[PDB]
Amino acid sequence: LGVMKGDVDRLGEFFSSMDSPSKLATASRFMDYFFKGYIGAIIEGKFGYIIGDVPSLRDWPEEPDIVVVYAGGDDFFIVGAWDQIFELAFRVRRAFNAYTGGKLTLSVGLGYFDERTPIYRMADVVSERLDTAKDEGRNRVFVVGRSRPLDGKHKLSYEWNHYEELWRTYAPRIYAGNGRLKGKLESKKGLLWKLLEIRELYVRDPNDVRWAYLTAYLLGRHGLSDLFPELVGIDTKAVERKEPQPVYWVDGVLKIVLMAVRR
């Protein structure tokens, strides 16, 4: 069950910009009609000119299985089929970024919970995955429960633009669509778990470079030397920026491809 709960950030600072009752009644109504009216037309499957292409496991159905629980005007809480809520969050954010003229942003905190789960825990964990994606940069999406080092240099939830290029690189080369994998990568779903084991060596020791050759060898034995060129080599640009290595970002982009297959 794919729960998402996201809200507009810095909105209380935005309504203090208005300086008359003519101006505040407008800005609190155009902001009102996005999460009231125009979020219905997104889920109905419209506006491809405005949105473009989202990180999407399969193209949008005619009658999607989405249940809008609540959507207030600053806030929303939407449940649904857990790989369409994944598609919807990048489809809500993209349409919100053109409804506003590129000025206000969302912070969507995605969770994934089983059907046998009480709702008072689903709202509890997702709202904490929200405040994880709120206190860091206020323009960033949480996607999957992900393990991190205890340094503080490594922040969890993905920036919106930073994630949607990780889908453009990693996904159309290891995933084809509709819950199946690319050519000759089937009977190698054990590989992508092993590739997420080498990410778990980066977490016990970030300083080790044991992940650099294990990345190159496992692609060698399986004959898949062409996939993942960003992961086989270290980035000297990423060391001096004190940003995570490209094996840190690969966890969330692999799991969505992996969970969309039966795994």
């Binding site: 470079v209 044991r210 650099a212 050759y213 294990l214 190159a216 060898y217 692609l219 060698g220 034995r221 030397s225 086989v232 270290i234 060391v239």
Partner: protein, 141 residues
């Protein structure tokens, strides 16, 4: 191709012997050089089946570093002369390929007899597997 095998090897050999001890640098250097080690061994054949006796000799006492013994004398004896026995049994066109692989490990083995046993041989064994792993990635096995 082979023109990279002439230039990059002669760029790396003076850097090879000048760091003869296996405890040269635990930082990003020994992994950055190790790709260049397999970069001029790429254009050579470098078959692994003759090395399987040496690597299993490195394997069977890698557990014995790990609370097995505190003596790597009897193992590292067996690694020195068999690696000389590698050209000492196999000659030919694979000999010119295996002479360049001889000159990196033989400075590091002589450290390991008088070295620490928990340390400085792990720093060798990590440089052992860095040579093999990229060699599978450039197209050799």
């Amino acid at each position: 191709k082979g023109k990279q095998w002439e230039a990059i090897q002669p760029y790396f050999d003076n850097v090879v012997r000048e760091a003869k001890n296996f405890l040269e640098w635990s930082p990003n250097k020994r992994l950055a050089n190790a790709v260049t080690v397999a970069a001029y061994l790429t254009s050579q054949g470098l078959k692994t089946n003759q090395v399987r006796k040496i690597l299993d000799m490195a394997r069977t006492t890698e557990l014995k570093v790990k609370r097995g013994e505190g003596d790597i004398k009897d193992d590292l004896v067996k690694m020195r002369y068999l690696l000389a026995y590698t050209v000492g049994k196999a000659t030919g066109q694979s000999k010119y390929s295996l002479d360049a692989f001889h000159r990196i490990l033989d400075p590091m083995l002589e450290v390991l007899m008088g070295s620490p046993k928990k340390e400085n041989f792990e720093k060798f064994y990590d440089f052992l597997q860095a040579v093999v792993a990229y060699h599978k990635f450039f197209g050799g096995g």
